[PDB]
Amino acid sequence: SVERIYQKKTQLEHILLRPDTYIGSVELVTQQMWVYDEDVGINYREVTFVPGLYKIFDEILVNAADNKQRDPKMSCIRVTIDPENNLISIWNNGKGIPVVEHKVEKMYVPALIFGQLLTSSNYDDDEKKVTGGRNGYGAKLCNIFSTKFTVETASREYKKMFKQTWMDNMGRAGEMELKPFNGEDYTCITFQPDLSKFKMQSLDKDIVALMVRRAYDIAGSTKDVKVFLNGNKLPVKGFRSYVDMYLKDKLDETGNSLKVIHEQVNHRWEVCLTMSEKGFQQISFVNSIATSKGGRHVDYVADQIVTKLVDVVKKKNAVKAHQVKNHMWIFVNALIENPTFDSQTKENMTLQPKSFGSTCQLSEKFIKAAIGC
C-alpha cells in the first residue's frame, strides 16, 4: 500500500532505525586500533567491537571534559565500568547544572537537556567556546541507546540536587527527585547500555579496552584534570606523558629507538612528531574529542612541517608532498573555536585554519629537530 511504502518517522524513531550517522555502526566490526589492555598498556591490535557502543560512552565522557571549560575549578573525572552489572558511570566535579525550572520549556533544566533532542548550551557561536559539544544530541543519544539512564547533578548555587532516571531507550521517564543541597557541586551520569541494540552479551574485553584507552585520552588531552577509572587514578600528566605511552620503548625498524620531537606551541596547541614505518599516521584531539580520521587541525600542523622538509630537499637536489608525509607519525592536541565535523561522531574536523581562533607556528627549534630526524 501507499502508506506502507511512503513513511514518515519521528526523530526518535529515525535514530533507532538509522543509527549510523548518529553514533556510528551498531554492527560488530573487526579491525586494528589502539586500545589499553590491562597488564599490557596502550597497544595496537585487532579488536571486535560495536562502534555505536564505544560512541555513546564517548559522548558522556566528552561532556565531562567540556565542563572543565565551563568551570576551570573542575579538577576531576571519575569513570566506572562494570561488565557484571552492565553499568557505566561518569562523574565530574566543578559547577553542576542549574537545578531550576526552565522558564520557556517549563521543566527543570537537567531534564530538558538530557531528555529532549536538540537541546544544548552550545548553540550560540558568538561565545566562541572551545567545548567539544556542538549539536545538542550527544547525551540524548546515550540515553536512547540505554535501557536505564540516570542523571544526577548538584548545584550549590541553586541549593538543590537533581536526580532523574530514564528507561527503555528514553521512551520512559521516572520521577524527578529534588533535594536541598549545600555541598561541593558534581554531575554523575550512570547508564546501562542496551546491549540488545548492539547484539552483545556483555561489556567484553575488547570494548572495555577501547573505553579505558579513551579515558587515558581524556587524561592526556585535558589540563589539570585527574582521571580515575574504577577507583584507580590514571598516571598521566600532560599531553607529552600520554604520547610517551605510545612510543616509550618502541624501536625503529633498524633497531635504533625512535626519536620524538615535542613542542607545546601555546595554550591551545601541543604537537609531537616521530617517524612512521607504515605510511602517514596521526593521533589527534580537538577540544578533547578523539578526531580519529583527522581533519584541518592535523593538515595545518603536518603541512608546515612537510613544506619545511621539502624546502630542504630542494637544496640537496622534485619530492612530492605525500612522499614526505608517508614517513610521518604526528600527535596533535588542540583547542578550536566552534569546530565543525562531517558527522555527529566527530571523527573528522573540517573547520578552516583561518577560523580556528588561534595559530600554531612550530618553533625553529622544533623544525630544526624535525629537519634532522
Where on the chain is the footprint of a second copy (CB under 8 A)?
1-11, 14, 17-18, 20-21, 24-25, 27, 29, 98, 100, 102-105, 109, 112-113, 116, 118-121, 123-124, 134-136, 277-279, 320-322, 326, 340-345, 347, 350, 352, 355
CA distance 189 to 180: 20
Nearer CB in complex with ligand ANP: 140/214:
140
**Binding track, positions 69-108, relative to Mg ion; x by CB under 5 A:** ----------------------------------------
Alpha-carbon distance of 81 to 208, in angstroms, equals 8
Candidate list 25, 89, 135, 165; residue touching ligand ANP; CB under 6 A: 135
Cβ of residue 216: shortest distance to ligand ANP, in angstroms?
19
SS3 of 226, please? Answer: strand
Does residue 137 touch ligand ANP according to CB under 6 A?
A: yes
> In terms of CB distance, is 64 or 305 closer to ligand ANP?
64
Quick one: 275 exposed, middle or buried, by C-beta within 10 A (0-12, 13-18, 19+)? middle
133 lies in the binding site for ligand ANP (CB under 6 A): yes
32 SS3 class: strand
265: exposed, middle or buried (C-beta count within 10 Å: 0-12, 13-18, 19+)?
middle
Q: Is 140 annotated as a binding residue?
A: yes
C-alpha 77: how far from its chain's center? 14
Residue listed under C-alpha cell 541507546: 145
Q: How far, in Å, CA of 69 to CA of 84, rounded?
A: 34
Q: Which does 82 bind (CB under 5 to 8 A by kind): a second copy, Mg ion, ligand ANP, none?
A: none
Contact 181, 155 (CB under 8 A): yes
Question: Does 92 appear as a known binding residue?
Answer: yes
Please state, in angstroms and rounded to a whole number, the distance separating the CA atoms of residues 286 and 270: 11
* Site membership for ligand ANP, residue 56 (CB under 6 A): no
97 or 209, CB closer to ligand ANP? 97
Contact region with ligand ANP (CB under 6 A), list: 116-124, 209-217, 244-252, 350-358: 116-124
Rg of the Cα atoms in the chain = 22
Which residues form the interface with Mg ion (CB under 5 A)?
Answer: 63, 133, 138
Residue ranges for the known binding site for ATP are 63, 92, 120-122, 133-140, 344-346
